[PDB]
Amino acid sequence: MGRDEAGITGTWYNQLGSTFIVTAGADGALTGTYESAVGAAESRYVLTGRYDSAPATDGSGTALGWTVAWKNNYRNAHSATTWSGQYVGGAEARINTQWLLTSGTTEANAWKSTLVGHDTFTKVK
Amino acid sequence: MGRDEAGITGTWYNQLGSTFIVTAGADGALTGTYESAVGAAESRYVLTGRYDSAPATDGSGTALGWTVAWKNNYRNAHSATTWSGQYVGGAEARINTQWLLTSGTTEANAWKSTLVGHDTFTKVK
Amino acid sequence: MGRDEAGITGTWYNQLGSTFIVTAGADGALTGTYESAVGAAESRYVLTGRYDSAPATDGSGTALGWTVAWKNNYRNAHSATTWSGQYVGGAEARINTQWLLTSGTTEANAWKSTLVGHDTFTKVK
Amino acid sequence: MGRDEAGITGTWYNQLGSTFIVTAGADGALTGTYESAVGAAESRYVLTGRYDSAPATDGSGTALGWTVAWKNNYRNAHSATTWSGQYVGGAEARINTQWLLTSGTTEANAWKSTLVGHDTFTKVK
């Protein structure tokens, strides 16, 4: 099994009130669902990603990332977000991320296609 | 099938000489392998991601993203990159992306954990 | 005078313990000094930037940005950070930012030249 | 004088057709005007920034950054862009940047306040 397979697997909540439900595989796979509290989103969306299944043992976090394309049976926002970050274990376990949200645009509007931000996920709230 | 399922599936090359091999599923799945020409990388790494399988029909690109965790049997760089971007079809087809590369760090070094950049992928070179 | 000239001018502190001392001009100028609690930095560095001197009156924040090149008489880290964000007034006044920190690199290493992060500045601590 | 004071000072053009006119001071100051070919912009805007006036001599680029707040006598877009990058000298001299464009928003919309992109500036076109 992956070192933080147990630590990562489960339900996570960010500062916006969004819900991230993920299963970490022994090989490095992340699969689950994402529900955003904001934006052009309704209900759950598929996510997939990857994590470092053999992280450093020096107190460093565990690198990971995942993607959601914002299409499900209720809604299509013609966009995708990727979160890139690290898992930090312990009593106050966290996933600290930065994200890039790209919308489909014409070539003329591609300069304004991509939003950037940061989400912190915790096991409570 | 997804609108750009055929357009996205295949081999792509970026400005650094890296090779992105991807299969787009009808549902929105991206699976494949990534080989970086630079950095702490050797040979192929698993990737997974998502794309908008029903994009707009107004000339807009197709939003997508994917993740690579930089661990395989040869090397572990304790890091993950996510690419967020859009596919643009046509004779000069492209995937234009921005990326976030997070390394596992201690809490003290988390401020310097994340690199940002941009890759443009084409079907040739 | 600028709408938030009074609100912006002064001393600000971020989550890392860094100190941002700024004067906002009536025209949109930002001038001052920055002292980082982390990284390849010692003592104060010159900063300059700009802010929207006539922001919206709908409860929106006030857009602004500034730059520090990390050279002073004590130290040169061959790098520059830009912070881009907005000022939010009130009892819990804040400047919420995202930043890009570019280091001078060879062309071969340019892909790994730029760090990204986020700082929140407040009037206390 | 700064090592690349002469190299940086002048007129630069990016891939969008925007015009960046800058004077580099011996101390590290950047002052000038910016004219964007795209977005909510008309004519010239004030810019200010900083550069490393004593860069490395190992073939590395010269770190720099600057800010434009998008208010002038013609237009106010309640936003600011910061460019962070490096100057690379030679026959094909370039300023390679990444940028963050923050708009003033309500707290509810702050998650979608910031665009990210990349501009490459050259002395011709």
Side-chain angles (χ1 to χ4, degrees), chain C residues 27-28 30 46-56 58-69 71 76-86 88-89 94 96 98-107 109-110 113-114 116-117, chain D residues 27-28 30 46-56 58-69 71 76-86 88-89 94 96 98-107 109-110 113-114 116-117:
Chain C
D27 62 331
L30 299 177
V46 173
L47 72 91
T48 187
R50 303 289 297 166
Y51 76 105
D52 180 3
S53 56
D58 64 349
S60 296
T62 298
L64 81 179
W66 69 93
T67 305
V68 168
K71 175 181 179 293
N76 194 347
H78 302 310
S79 55
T81 304
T82 64
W83 289 258
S84 182
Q86 61 184 315
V88 183
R94 300 187 319 286
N96 297 315
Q98 296 187 85
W99 53 254
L100 295 170
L101 162 51
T102 307
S103 293
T105 68
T106 59
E107 280 97 311
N109 295 330
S113 69
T114 311
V116 61
Chain D
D27 62 331
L30 299 177
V46 173
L47 72 91
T48 187
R50 303 289 297 166
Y51 76 105
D52 180 3
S53 56
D58 64 349
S60 296
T62 298
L64 81 179
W66 69 93
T67 305
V68 168
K71 175 181 179 293
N76 194 347
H78 302 310
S79 55
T81 304
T82 64
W83 289 258
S84 182
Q86 61 184 315
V88 183
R94 300 187 319 286
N96 297 315
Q98 296 187 85
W99 53 254
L100 295 170
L101 162 51
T102 307
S103 293
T105 68
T106 59
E107 280 97 311
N109 295 330
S113 69
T114 311
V116 61

Side-chain angles (χ1 to χ4, degrees), chain A residues 80-104:
Chain A
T81 304
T82 64
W83 289 258
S84 182
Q86 61 184 315
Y87 161 85
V88 183
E92 307 280 57
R94 300 187 319 286
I95 302 174
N96 297 315
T97 71
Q98 296 187 85
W99 53 254
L100 295 170
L101 162 51
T102 307
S103 293

Side-chain angles (χ1 to χ4, degrees), chain A residues 27-28 30 46-56 58-69 71 76-86 88-89 94 96 98-107 109-110 113-114 116-117, chain B residues 27-28 30 46-56 58-69 71 76-86 88-89 94 96 98-107 109-110 113-114 116-117:
Chain A
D27 62 331
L30 299 177
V46 173
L47 72 91
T48 187
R50 303 289 297 166
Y51 76 105
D52 180 3
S53 56
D58 64 349
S60 296
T62 298
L64 81 179
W66 69 93
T67 305
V68 168
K71 175 181 179 293
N76 194 347
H78 302 310
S79 55
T81 304
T82 64
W83 289 258
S84 182
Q86 61 184 315
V88 183
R94 300 187 319 286
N96 297 315
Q98 296 187 85
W99 53 254
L100 295 170
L101 162 51
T102 307
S103 293
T105 68
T106 59
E107 280 97 311
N109 295 330
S113 69
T114 311
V116 61
Chain B
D27 62 331
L30 299 177
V46 173
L47 72 91
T48 187
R50 303 289 297 166
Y51 76 105
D52 180 3
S53 56
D58 64 349
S60 296
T62 298
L64 81 179
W66 69 93
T67 305
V68 168
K71 175 181 179 293
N76 194 347
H78 302 310
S79 55
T81 304
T82 64
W83 289 258
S84 182
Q86 61 184 315
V88 183
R94 300 187 319 286
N96 297 315
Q98 296 187 85
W99 53 254
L100 295 170
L101 162 51
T102 307
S103 293
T105 68
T106 59
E107 280 97 311
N109 295 330
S113 69
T114 311
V116 61

Side-chain angles (χ1 to χ4, degrees), chain A residues 2 9 11 13 21 23 26 28 38 51 60 71 75 91 93 100-101 104 113 117 123:
Chain A
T9 295
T11 304
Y13 305 98
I21 295 168
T23 298
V38 303
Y51 76 105
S60 296
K71 175 181 179 293
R75 199 165 189 173
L100 295 170
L101 162 51
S113 69
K123 296 294 294 176

Side-chain angles (χ1 to χ4, degrees), chain D:
Chain D
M1 298 307 99
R3 174 152 22 251
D4 309 291
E5 190 178 349
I8 294 167
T9 295
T11 304
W12 293 88
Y13 305 98
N14 75 11
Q15 76 291 343
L16 298 166
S18 303
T19 304
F20 167 45
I21 295 168
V22 69
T23 298
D27 62 331
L30 299 177
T31 35
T33 63
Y34 200 98
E35 183 172 5
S36 181
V38 303
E42 178 177 352
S43 195
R44 291 182 306 286
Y45 296 81
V46 173
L47 72 91
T48 187
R50 303 289 297 166
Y51 76 105
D52 180 3
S53 56
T57 57
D58 64 349
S60 296
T62 298
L64 81 179
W66 69 93
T67 305
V68 168
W70 297 105
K71 175 181 179 293
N72 66 13
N73 293 331
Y74 300 110
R75 199 165 189 173
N76 194 347
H78 302 310
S79 55
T81 304
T82 64
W83 289 258
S84 182
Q86 61 184 315
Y87 161 85
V88 183
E92 307 280 57
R94 300 187 319 286
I95 302 174
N96 297 315
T97 71
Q98 296 187 85
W99 53 254
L100 295 170
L101 162 51
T102 307
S103 293
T105 68
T106 59
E107 280 97 311
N109 295 330
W111 70 273
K112 56 174 182 185
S113 69
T114 311
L115 293 163
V116 61
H118 46 96
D119 288 352
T120 301
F121 296 86
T122 57
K123 296 294 294 176
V124 302
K125 160 199 122 196

